[PDB]
Design a protein around this nucleic acid. Structure first.
Ligand SMILES: [Mg+2]
Ligand SMILES: [Mg+2]
Ligand SMILES: [Mg+2]
Length: 135
RNA sequence: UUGUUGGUUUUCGGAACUGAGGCCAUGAUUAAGAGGGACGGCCGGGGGCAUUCGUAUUGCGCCGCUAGAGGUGAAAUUCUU
């Protein structure tokens, strides 16, 4: 079902991983990124909203992305990790490691890894007020 | 400053204006680790006007795949074939 490639050569995809503190997205596209092979999220694997960002949920999602990518015919992935970005946090959420760990452990070749968190050159006011989120 | 009068022969001192002189060693303290100002080469997210760029947030159009997404201590209001 995949492309006709020599067995000494492999076909590359791009896995956009969006690891927030509320959910994890494992999204594999082609090199252009316009076409999609398989987007599974951490909320598609758990029943509780609290666990949508869990490392376990991120691992299970990465595993479904790995199987679909292989059956479609992807063999290697370029990783593009991102946090929420913008005015929000820049550290990737707890599911970032498990998703990338699960991809490598699922027999998925890894190409180039790069952080793509959108960083503002300063921007819109952040939510919370000047006194912040007084939790 | 002439005692027979008066005219005094008058002189007299002072007070103004004015010209030419000489003479004074002729006449201006210093340059504030006070200040002002000049100049010189710099220096600075100092101020005003115009201009340029940056990515992000939000919205929209097209395309892809898909059933969730979001949010939280947990949720729900909310968005969604
Ligand atoms: Mg969540
Ligand atoms: Mg959620
Ligand atoms: Mg406190």
């Amino acid at each position: 079902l995949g492309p006709q490639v020599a067995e000494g050569e492999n076909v590359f995809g791009v896995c956009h991983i969006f690891a927030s503190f509320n959910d994890t997205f494992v999204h594999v596209t082609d090199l252009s990124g316009k076409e999609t092979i398989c987007r599974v999220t951490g909320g598609m694997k758990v029943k509780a909203d609290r666990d949508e960002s869990s490392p376990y949920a991120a691992m299970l999602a990465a595993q479904d992305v790995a199987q679909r990518c292989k059956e479609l015919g992807i063999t290697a992935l370029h990783i593009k990790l991102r946090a929420t970005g913008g005015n929000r946090t820049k550290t990737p959420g707890p599911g970032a490691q498990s998703a990338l760990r699960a991809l490598a452990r699922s027999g998925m070749k890894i190409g180039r890894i790069e952080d793509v968190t959108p960083i503002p050159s300063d921007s819109t006011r952040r939510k919370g007020g000047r006194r912040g989120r007084r939790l």
